Amino acid sequence: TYNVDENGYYGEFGGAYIPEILHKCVEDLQNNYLKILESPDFQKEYDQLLRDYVGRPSPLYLAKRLSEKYGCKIYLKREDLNHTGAHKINNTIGQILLARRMGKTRIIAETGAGQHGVATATVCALMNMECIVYMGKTDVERQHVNVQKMEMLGATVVPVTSGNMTLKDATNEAIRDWCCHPSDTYYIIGSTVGPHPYPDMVARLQSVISKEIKKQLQEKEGRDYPDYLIACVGGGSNAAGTIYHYIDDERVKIVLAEAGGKGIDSGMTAATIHLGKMGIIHGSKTLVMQNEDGQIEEPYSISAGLDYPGIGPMHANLAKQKRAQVLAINDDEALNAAFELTRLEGIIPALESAHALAALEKVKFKPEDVVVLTLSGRGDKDMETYLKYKK
Amino acid sequence: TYNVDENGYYGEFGGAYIPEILHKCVEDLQNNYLKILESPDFQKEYDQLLRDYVGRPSPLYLAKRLSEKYGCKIYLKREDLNHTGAHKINNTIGQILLARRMGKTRIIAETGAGQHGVATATVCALMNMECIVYMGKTDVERQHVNVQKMEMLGATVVPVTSGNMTLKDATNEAIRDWCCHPSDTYYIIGSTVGPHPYPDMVARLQSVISKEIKKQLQEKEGRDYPDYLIACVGGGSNAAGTIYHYIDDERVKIVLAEAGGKGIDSGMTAATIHLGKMGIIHGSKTLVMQNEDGQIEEPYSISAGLDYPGIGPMHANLAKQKRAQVLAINDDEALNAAFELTRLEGIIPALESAHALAALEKVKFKPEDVVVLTLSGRGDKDMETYLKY
Numbered sequence: 068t069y070n071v072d073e074n075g076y077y078g079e080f081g082g083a084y085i086p087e088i089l090h091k092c093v094e095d096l097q098n099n100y101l102k103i104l105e106s107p108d109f110q111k112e113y114d115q116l117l118r119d120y121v122g123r124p125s126p127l128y129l130a131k132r133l134s135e136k137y138g139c140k141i142y143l144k145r146e147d148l149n150h151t152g153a154h155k156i157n158n159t160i161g162q163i164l165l166a167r168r169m170g171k172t173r174i175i176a177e178t179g180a181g182q183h184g185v186a187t188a189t190v191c192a193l194m195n196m197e198c199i200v201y202m203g204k205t206d207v208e209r210q211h212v213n214v215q216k217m218e219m220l221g222a223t224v225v226p227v228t229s230g231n232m233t234l235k236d237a238t239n240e241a242i243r244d245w246c247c248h249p250s251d252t253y254y255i256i257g258s259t260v261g262p263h264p265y266p267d268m269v270a271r272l273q274s275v276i277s278k279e280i281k282k283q284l285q286e287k288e289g290r291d292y293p294d295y296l297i298a299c300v301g302g303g304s305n306a307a308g309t310i311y312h313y314i315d316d317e318r319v320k321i322v323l324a325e326a327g328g329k330g331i332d333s334g335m336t337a338a339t340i341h342l343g344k345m346g347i348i349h350g351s352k353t354l355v356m357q358n359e360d361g362q363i364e365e366p367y368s369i370s371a372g373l374d375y376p377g378i379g380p381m382h383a384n385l386a387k388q389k390r391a392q393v394l395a396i397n398d399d400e401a402l403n404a405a406f407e408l409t410r411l412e413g414i415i416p417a418l419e420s421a422h423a424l425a426a427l428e429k430v431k432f433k434p435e436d437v438v439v440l441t442l443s444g445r446g447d448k449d450m451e452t453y454l455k456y457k458k
Numbered sequence: 459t460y461n462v463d464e465n466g467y468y469g470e471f472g473g474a475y476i477p478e479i480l481h482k483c484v485e486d487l488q489n490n491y492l493k494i495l496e497s498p499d500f501q502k503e504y505d506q507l508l509r510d511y512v513g514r515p516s517p518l519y520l521a522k523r524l525s526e527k528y529g530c531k532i533y534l535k536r537e538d539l540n541h542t543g544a545h546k547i548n549n550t551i552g553q554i555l556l557a558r559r560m561g562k563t564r565i566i567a568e569t570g571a572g573q574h575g576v577a578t579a580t581v582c583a584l585m586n587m588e589c590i591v592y593m594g595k596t597d598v599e600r601q602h603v604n605v606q607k608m609e610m611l612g613a614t615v616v617p618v619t620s621g622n623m624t625l626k627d628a629t630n631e632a633i634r635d636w637c638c639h640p641s642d643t644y645y646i647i648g649s650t651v652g653p654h655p656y657p658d659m660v661a662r663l664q665s666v667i668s669k670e671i672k673k674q675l676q677e678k679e680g681r682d683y684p685d686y687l688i689a690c691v692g693g694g695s696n697a698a699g700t701i702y703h704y705i706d707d708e709r710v711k712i713v714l715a716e717a718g719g720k721g722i723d724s725g726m727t728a729a730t731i732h733l734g735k736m737g738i739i740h741g742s743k744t745l746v747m748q749n750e751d752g753q754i755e756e757p758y759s760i761s762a763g764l765d766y767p768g769i770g771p772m773h774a775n776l777a778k779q780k781r782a783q784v785l786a787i788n789d790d791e792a793l794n795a796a797f798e799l800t801r802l803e804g805i806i807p808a809l810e811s812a813h814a815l816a817a818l819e820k821v822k823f824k825p826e827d828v829v830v831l832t833l834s835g836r837g838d839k840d841m842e843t844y845l846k847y
């Protein structure tokens with residue numbers, strides 16, 4: 068299987084490469100997570116909140132003008148319509164329910180651009196649970212609306228002033244925090260990253276996407292599988308959910324779009340699958356962009372959501388084994404695709420999602436091909452970028 | 459009976475108070491709109507787009523922390539989750555579907571704060587149809603993000619410099635364009651305002667809200683009606699939609715929240731039901747805020763979306779007959795309610811919708827009351843205002 072194996076690995080990638088201090092809390096999570104996620108109590112509450120609070124199922128929308136342009140049937144999986152405007156809310160809802168079932172009361176997370184921090188604070192408001200979000204001080208400074216939303220939602224935002232004051236430092240303080248609070252604290256990881264069981268956990272939470280796609284395609288096409296699944300990747304969570312229930316069925320082609328930034332040869336890029344080497348990042352053995360001194364490098368993308376140096380182990384494995392095609396989509400290609408979707412379907416996509424849309428230009432589709440592309444988010448949050456880069 | 463009568467009136471209110479130029483285009487719409495709206499072909503495409511493009515049905519969400527706070531069961535009808543972030547998309551989808559079944563190919567609309575202009579441009583992009591939005595130049599200057607959105611969506615934004623250079627003037631110019639274009643043009647009005655049949659048409663399009671509430675209450679509560687419907691009003695479309703299927707059921711109390719601004723006695727207000735006089739606005743007989751010289755006033759609210767001098771005739775009638783309770787909610791009250799919902803439920807409401815939320819402090823609830831409150835929009839667009847408070 069291309070899902071996780073019984074040891075926490077996706078082929079050679081993944082596992083739990085963690086200091087001894089994390090051994091106990093990660094082991095404890097490993098023991099709990101599947102028992103709770105498979106339980107009917109959990110499934111019932113998760114489904115109810117996903118329906119009433121998030122608004123699931125997200126529609127599967129036949130984009131008729133896009134379909135005309137690319138000469139095939141293109142459905143858009145509309146995660147952009149979720150409460151909070153992206154798929155991250157599926158994961159924060161799932162993990163807060165897990166946390167509660169583990170008897171945890173204090174919820175912590177880190178955030179870079181602010182989206183995961185908002186998704187985390189959102190569910191902590193819902194649940195009336197103490198919420199602390201760690202955020203690199205440089206990230207804090209230039210993400211003031213997200214900081215303000217977190218604070219409105221009643222979370223405490225902790226500016227992280229250690230190291231370079233970036234996402235890496237915030238991640239480090241969050242992990243330290245969790246480790247030091249084995250009694251009461253649960254750490255909500257933001258993507259399909261981190262030590263086992265977090266990658267599998269987050270993929271399972273996001274698998275609601277492909278669960279729905281199966282039902283929706285059956286109703287609309289009379290078959291339960293598309294010819295292509297297309298998603299953007301940062302850490303890999305919306306892609307993991309999109310492909311989860313199709314991951315071993317090679318009839319369904321997988322196209323992953325990563326952030327090329329200014330171009331894979333430009334030195335300002337986030338194309339981890341194309342350019343990364345093996346490394347350990349946040350306890351996971353995976354591909355990581357490293358500089359000539361072996362140091363975890365500084366990625367660049369127009370989209371903050373995709374400018375992570377690592378990739379989830381799932382996708383490293385999919386790419387190596389050639390189960391998925393991976394494209395490095397550049398900033399200009401993503402912007403062009405965002406403006407195109409806006410004009411053709413009246414949907415303003417997230418800049419992340421726009422990388423996936425740009426992939427449509429790169430693949431020669433057949434007229435009977437059925438493509439499902441995950442519109443991971445809406446583009447309201449990106450409007451300042453869109454106004455600056457327009458025309 | 460509280461819905462439109464056979465002549466376009468709601469008691470004495472409504473009708474079509476128009477010059478001769480308009481008579482042709484308005485009569486045409488009056489004669490044809492309802493048979494299209496009621497037709498299976500229309501209903502099938504409307505439902506398909508509402509499901510797959512907008513994400514309907516919008517959930518009915520039991521807000522447990524809000525419910526515990528006010529001592530009863532408060533369901534939020536989640537129009538905030540729709541594509542575009544509000545209920546206006548229900549109206550633009552419905553009306554462009556009508557326009558197409560009428561053979562019209564050029565689409566025009568007015569907008570104030572920009573939300574209707576966005577919702578119109580949105581569906582014209584989908585449908586690949588020419589779109590022109592009239593917008594007061596003051597509003598163009600106040601709403602740079604919405605203007606740029608409309609342009610990204612393919613629409614032409616026409617700055618209107620007549621009158622006060624705001625919503626009433628843009629409405630005036632849209633109407634005037636329409637009348638000059640008998641061949642090819644359909645005018646998507648943005649609220650339950652204007653000449654018959656626009657009030658009734660928009661209310662019917664928005665009635666999907668209450669059609670859903672019925673099924674959703676049946677499933678959740680066993681009965682299909684609440685004790686209260688609570689909604690905010692500008693022109694009155696989300697409210698009309700919310701009440702449409704309940705409007706003659708006296709068991710259902712209706713509470714409409716209007717924008718008090720800095721207070722009804724402040725000089726800076728938008729509380730049309732409380733302060734308006736009978737008069738004509740945009741070919742509709744209704745309540746209209748007027749200066750002492752009898753001209754249409756510039757309203758004020760912290761929420762730009764409630765900058766309506768007039769109100770839909772439906773609501774003038776509901777208020778005069780005491781079928782609805784009407785509350786004038788001040789800026790402060792709306793702001794506190796927005797912060798309250800954000801903290802209690804993790805939902806950042808539109809400032810328009812926050813006026814309905816603030817009505818929760820004002821109503822004496824019984825423990826076994828079931829309230830449905832229409833969360834007309836999300837509040838992403840309002841974060842710069844919330845930051846300041």
